Design a protein around this ligand. Structure first.
Ligand SMILES: Cc1cc(-c2cccc(Cl)c2)n[nH]1
Length: 281
């Protein structure tokens, strides 16, 4: 049983697709697939898995199925009555955002306005989640996807594994994306996602760098609790960095909600001094 947006659903509300219509085309590093012809992404549940795993996998399908927003990957259906168990998802030809930023890094193509649109796209999805009282818990560039690598790309939140687990270890917590109260007290609110979006904003304008580059998890933990914060990414415009620093306010009540973040991202797309800033090569 899953609840969201005022309703409770179950494995039944999902759209079961008969296994016979589903064809795998590639591994994607998750597979490209076909449904008779619709092009989809197929998330597979290993047959070698525990019973906790099985329930983990079912919840994710219910979670993503209850969202209706252009910046959240669509759930096409499921194939759970056959093995291995499939979740069918919107295909995002652009791939994940962290790799795209790394491969598309300018070299001897991509401009400041493109990064702001990605940031706006993800901020729009987070607002939708916030307005519906869903806490993602793992906003990060690795969990965002792009429709296409070229112009007119749209970014969307693509993975909800963390929100399903707490619905898995100290060395596995995304500490570098978490605010103090989260890794200290295990408190999670919409203001948890605000902090994480700030780190995501740093990932975006650093063009795919790991946050707190030379630090370890425990170093970051002690750095952040003491009040330390990352420096601007190379060439990052001031107005963009100021969004990050507002997202990283120590007290959650001093952080902006996602409506304000969107508002400030849009004001940055209207500033020539911002969008005419060159990326580092
Ligand atoms: C849920 C989902 C993942 C993807 C995808 C991941 C990596 C590369 C590419 Cl081309 C697509 N699309 N949809």
């Amino acid at each position: 049983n899953y609840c969201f947006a005022g309703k409770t659903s179950s494995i039944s509300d999902l759209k079961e697709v008969p296994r016979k219509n589903i064809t795998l085309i590639r591994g994607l590093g998750v597979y490209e697939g076909q449904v008779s012809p619709l092009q989809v992404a197929v998330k597979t549940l290993p047959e070698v898995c525990s019973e906790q795993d099985e329930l983990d996998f079912l919840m994710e399908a219910l979670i993503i199925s209850k969202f209706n927003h252009q910046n959240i990957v669509r759930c096409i259906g499921v194939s759970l009555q056959s093995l291995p168990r499939f979740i069918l998802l919107e295909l995002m030809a652009g791939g994940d955002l962290k790799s795209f930023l790394r491969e598309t890094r300018p070299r001897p193509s991509l401009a400041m306005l493109d990064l702001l649109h990605v940031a706006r796209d993800i901020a729009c999805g987070c607002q939708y989640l916030e307005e519906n009282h869903f806490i993602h818990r793992d906003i990060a560039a690795r969990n965002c996807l792009l429709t296409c690598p070229g112009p007119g790309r749209v970014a969307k939140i693509g993975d909800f594994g963390m929100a399903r687990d707490i619905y898995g270890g100290c060395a596995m917590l995304p500490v570098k994306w978490m605010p103090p109260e989260a890794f200290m007290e295990g408190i999670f609110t919409s203001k948890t996602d605000t902090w994480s979006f700030g780190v995501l904003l740093w990932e975006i304008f650093s063009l795919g760098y790991m946050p707190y580059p030379s630090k370890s998890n425990q170093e970051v933990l002690e750095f952040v609790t003491s009040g330390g914060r990352m420096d601007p990414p190379k060439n990052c415009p001031g107005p963009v960095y100021r969004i990050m620093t507002q997202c990283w306010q120590h007290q959650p009540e001093d952080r902006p909600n996602f409506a304000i973040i969107l508002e400030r991202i849009e004001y940055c797309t209207q500033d020539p001094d911002v969008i005419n800033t060159a990326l580092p090569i």
